[PDB]
Write an enzyme that holds these catalytic residues in place. Structure first.
Site, PDB file in Angstrom:
ATOM      1  N   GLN A 199     -18.240  -8.032  76.482  1.00  0.00           N
ATOM      2  CA  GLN A 199     -19.131  -6.932  77.387  1.00  0.00           C
ATOM      3  C   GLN A 199     -18.705  -5.580  77.327  1.00  0.00           C
ATOM      4  O   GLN A 199     -17.347  -5.187  77.441  1.00  0.00           O
ATOM      5  CB  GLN A 199     -19.001  -7.356  78.557  1.00  0.00           C
ATOM      6  N   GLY A 200     -19.437  -4.671  77.384  1.00  0.00           N
ATOM      7  CA  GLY A 200     -18.873  -3.149  77.055  1.00  0.00           C
ATOM      8  C   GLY A 200     -19.071  -2.685  75.856  1.00  0.00           C
ATOM      9  O   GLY A 200     -18.799  -1.474  75.754  1.00  0.00           O
TER      10      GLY A 200
ATOM     11  N   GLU B 134     -14.083  15.860  71.687  1.00  0.00           N
ATOM     12  CA  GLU B 134     -15.262  15.197  72.096  1.00  0.00           C
ATOM     13  C   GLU B 134     -16.317  16.272  71.670  1.00  0.00           C
ATOM     14  O   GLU B 134     -16.389  17.716  71.932  1.00  0.00           O
ATOM     15  CB  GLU B 134     -15.407  14.838  73.558  1.00  0.00           C
ATOM     16  CG  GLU B 134     -14.158  13.964  73.858  1.00  0.00           C
ATOM     17  CD  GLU B 134     -12.841  14.423  74.246  1.00  0.00           C
ATOM     18  OE1 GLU B 134     -12.711  15.716  73.801  1.00  0.00           O
ATOM     19  OE2 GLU B 134     -12.033  13.676  74.761  1.00  0.00           O
TER      20      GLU B 134
ATOM     21  N   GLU C 253     -14.683  10.530  70.631  1.00  0.00           N
ATOM     22  CA  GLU C 253     -14.011  10.091  72.125  1.00  0.00           C
ATOM     23  C   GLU C 253     -12.890   9.192  71.208  1.00  0.00           C
ATOM     24  O   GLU C 253     -13.082   8.147  70.398  1.00  0.00           O
ATOM     25  CB  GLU C 253     -14.575   9.000  72.743  1.00  0.00           C
ATOM     26  CG  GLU C 253     -15.742   9.853  73.578  1.00  0.00           C
ATOM     27  CD  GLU C 253     -14.930  10.474  74.896  1.00  0.00           C
ATOM     28  OE1 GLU C 253     -13.756  10.611  74.773  1.00  0.00           O
ATOM     29  OE2 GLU C 253     -15.662  10.989  75.906  1.00  0.00           O
TER      30      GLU C 253
ATOM     31  N   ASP D 275     -13.083 -11.455  69.466  1.00  0.00           N
ATOM     32  CA  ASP D 275     -14.584 -11.274  69.440  1.00  0.00           C
ATOM     33  C   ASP D 275     -14.721 -10.001  70.090  1.00  0.00           C
ATOM     34  O   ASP D 275     -13.908  -9.170  70.475  1.00  0.00           O
ATOM     35  CB  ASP D 275     -14.734 -12.344  70.350  1.00  0.00           C
ATOM     36  CG  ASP D 275     -16.629 -12.678  70.159  1.00  0.00           C
ATOM     37  OD1 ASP D 275     -17.390 -12.036  69.530  1.00  0.00           O
ATOM     38  OD2 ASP D 275     -16.649 -13.674  71.144  1.00  0.00           O
ATOM     39  N   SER D 276     -15.910  -9.558  70.176  1.00  0.00           N
ATOM     40  CA  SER D 276     -16.430  -8.703  70.913  1.00  0.00           C
ATOM     41  C   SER D 276     -16.894  -8.988  72.355  1.00  0.00           C
ATOM     42  O   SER D 276     -16.683 -10.143  72.739  1.00  0.00           O
ATOM     43  CB  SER D 276     -17.576  -7.894  70.430  1.00  0.00           C
ATOM     44  OG  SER D 276     -18.794  -8.671  70.181  1.00  0.00           O
TER      45      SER D 276
ATOM     46  N   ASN E 131      -9.777   8.211  74.097  1.00  0.00           N
ATOM     47  CA  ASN E 131      -9.507   7.715  75.223  1.00  0.00           C
ATOM     48  C   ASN E 131     -10.987   8.435  76.181  1.00  0.00           C
ATOM     49  O   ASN E 131     -11.065   9.426  76.426  1.00  0.00           O
ATOM     50  CB  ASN E 131      -8.411   8.370  76.189  1.00  0.00           C
ATOM     51  CG  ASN E 131      -8.116   7.756  77.553  1.00  0.00           C
ATOM     52  OD1 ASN E 131      -9.088   7.665  78.180  1.00  0.00           O
ATOM     53  ND2 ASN E 131      -6.811   7.490  77.616  1.00  0.00           N
TER      54      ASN E 131
ATOM     55  N   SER F 274     -21.263  -3.720  73.696  1.00  0.00           N
ATOM     56  CA  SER F 274     -22.788  -3.761  73.362  1.00  0.00           C
ATOM     57  C   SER F 274     -23.340  -2.436  72.688  1.00  0.00           C
ATOM     58  O   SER F 274     -23.037  -1.444  73.372  1.00  0.00           O
ATOM     59  CB  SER F 274     -23.328  -4.092  74.564  1.00  0.00           C
ATOM     60  OG  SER F 274     -23.521  -5.520  74.938  1.00  0.00           O
ATOM     61  N   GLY F 275     -24.176  -2.395  71.728  1.00  0.00           N
ATOM     62  CA  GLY F 275     -24.627  -1.520  70.992  1.00  0.00           C
ATOM     63  C   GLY F 275     -23.769  -0.654  69.990  1.00  0.00           C
ATOM     64  O   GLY F 275     -24.200   0.000  69.157  1.00  0.00           O
TER      65      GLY F 275
ATOM     66  N   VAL G 273     -10.178  10.729  79.429  1.00  0.00           N
ATOM     67  CA  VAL G 273      -9.414  11.717  79.138  1.00  0.00           C
ATOM     68  C   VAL G 273      -9.978  12.838  78.159  1.00  0.00           C
ATOM     69  O   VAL G 273     -10.338  12.197  77.169  1.00  0.00           O
ATOM     70  CB  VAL G 273      -7.876  11.649  78.719  1.00  0.00           C
ATOM     71  CG1 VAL G 273      -7.392  12.759  78.899  1.00  0.00           C
ATOM     72  CG2 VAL G 273      -7.451  10.741  79.892  1.00  0.00           C
TER      73      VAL G 273
ATOM     74  N   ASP H 126     -32.714  -6.618  68.890  1.00  0.00           N
ATOM     75  CA  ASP H 126     -31.944  -5.738  69.931  1.00  0.00           C
ATOM     76  C   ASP H 126     -31.465  -4.484  69.256  1.00  0.00           C
ATOM     77  O   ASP H 126     -30.202  -4.308  69.054  1.00  0.00           O
ATOM     78  CB  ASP H 126     -30.753  -6.529  70.241  1.00  0.00           C
ATOM     79  CG  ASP H 126     -30.156  -6.250  71.558  1.00  0.00           C
ATOM     80  OD1 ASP H 126     -30.419  -5.215  72.174  1.00  0.00           O
ATOM     81  OD2 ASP H 126     -29.183  -6.521  71.941  1.00  0.00           O
TER      82      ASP H 126
ATOM     83  N   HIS I 294     -30.841  -3.605  74.403  1.00  0.00           N
ATOM     84  CA  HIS I 294     -30.304  -4.084  75.827  1.00  0.00           C
ATOM     85  C   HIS I 294     -29.681  -2.773  76.554  1.00  0.00           C
ATOM     86  O   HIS I 294     -29.323  -3.161  77.551  1.00  0.00           O
ATOM     87  CB  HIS I 294     -29.920  -5.313  75.814  1.00  0.00           C
ATOM     88  CG  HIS I 294     -28.527  -5.412  75.690  1.00  0.00           C
ATOM     89  ND1 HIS I 294     -27.837  -5.988  74.315  1.00  0.00           N
ATOM     90  CD2 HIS I 294     -27.315  -5.217  76.223  1.00  0.00           C
ATOM     91  CE1 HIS I 294     -26.871  -5.945  74.235  1.00  0.00           C
ATOM     92  NE2 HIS I 294     -26.217  -5.624  75.800  1.00  0.00           N
TER      93      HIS I 294
HETATM   94  N1  LIG Z   1     -19.439 -11.231  71.832  1.00  0.00           N
HETATM   95  C1  LIG Z   1     -19.817 -11.336  73.062  1.00  0.00           C
HETATM   96  N2  LIG Z   1     -19.907 -12.060  73.835  1.00  0.00           N
HETATM   97  C2  LIG Z   1     -20.331 -11.914  75.191  1.00  0.00           C
HETATM   98  C3  LIG Z   1     -20.911 -10.475  74.896  1.00  0.00           C
HETATM   99  C4  LIG Z   1     -21.631  -9.519  75.895  1.00  0.00           C
HETATM  100  C5  LIG Z   1     -22.216  -8.283  75.113  1.00  0.00           C
HETATM  101  C6  LIG Z   1     -21.687  -8.028  74.005  1.00  0.00           C
HETATM  102  C7  LIG Z   1     -21.144  -9.022  72.955  1.00  0.00           C
HETATM  103  C8  LIG Z   1     -20.635 -10.051  73.747  1.00  0.00           C
HETATM  104 CA   LIG Z   2     -11.882  11.518  75.735  1.00  0.00          CA
END
Ligand SMILES: NC1=NCc2ccccc21
Ligand SMILES: [Ca+2]
Length: 223
Positions: free
Chosen positions: A174-175, A62, A52, A171-172, A54, A177-178, A57, A84, A40
């Site tokens: 948004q952002g 890198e 990476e 938890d994980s 930061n 992902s992957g 910066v 996925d 996705h």
């Molecule tokens: N653990 C997660 N809850 C919502 C979400 C979006 C994207 C990746 C992981 C999660």
């Molecule tokens: Ca950097």
């Protein structure tokens, strides 16, 4: 990552940032030429950013390398997020060092209760939005399949597992992902989806990498 901690620079040396003008997903370096991420996260024009901490910066360790090809799993279903997973080939091989390192693929699946390390640059708030500049980490156990399927009735396939805490708070998000879920030195998961972040009875859902090892190895050997 919600409820996690600052990893420390380059302490997760297989973690990559996928950049298309901005960070949009994580990934994991599996050899000098190839990255694993979530299907996705697919788009054209990906630059892989290795070494990476930061992401805003240039700190000096890198490597920025364009993708030459991306391969989404043939059975990926964008409606359900089943399968996925995707592979990204680097146009030039990464220079491997202590801060840019590959992560081993599973030799078998991992058990419920195994502790894993999940990492990323995603949102750190369960209500609202705050994006870190430095990499965040979370230690979390693999949850039983029954607890996972109870949290997400009708949505969990054999290619998914849950990890985290049914009480919420960690938890994980948004952002992330992957990015990687590493357990006992093996890449067992890819950050995939969830309902909210860090909510009670809604743990994160992860692509079950152990089901894909043959596909990964054969695909990279033929591409
Ligand atoms: N653990 C997660 N809850 C919502 C979400 C979006 C994207 C990746 C992981 C999660
Ligand atoms: Ca950097």
């Amino acid at each position: 990552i919600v409820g996690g901690y600052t990893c420390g620079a380059n302490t997760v040396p297989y973690q990559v940032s996928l950049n298309s003008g901005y960070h949009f997903c994580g990934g994991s370096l599996i050899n000098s030429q190839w990255v694993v991420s979530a299907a996705h996260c697919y788009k054209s024009g990906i630059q892989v950013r290795l070494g990476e901490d930061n992401i805003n910066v240039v700190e000096g360790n890198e490597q920025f390398i364009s993708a030459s090809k991306s391969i989404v799993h043939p059975s990926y279903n964008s409606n359900t997020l089943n399968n996925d997973i995707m592979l990204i080939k680097l146009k030039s091989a990464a220079s491997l060092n202590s801060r840019v390192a590959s992560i081993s693929l599973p030799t078998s699946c991992a058990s419920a209760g195994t502790q894993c390390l999940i990492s990323g640059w995603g949102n750190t708030k369960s209500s609202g939005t705050s994006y870190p500049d430095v990499l965040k980490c979370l230690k979390a156990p693999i949850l039983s399949d029954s607890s996972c399927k109870s949290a997400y009735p009708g949505q969990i396939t054999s290619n998914m597992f849950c990890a985290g805490y049914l009480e919420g708070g960690k938890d994980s998000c948004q952002g992330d992902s992957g990015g990687p879920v590493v357990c006992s030195g093996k890449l067992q998961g890819i950050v995939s989806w969830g309902s909210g972040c860090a909510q009670k009875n809604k743990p994160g859902v992860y692509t079950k990498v152990c089901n894909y090892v043959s596909w990964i190895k054969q695909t990279i050997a033929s591409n």
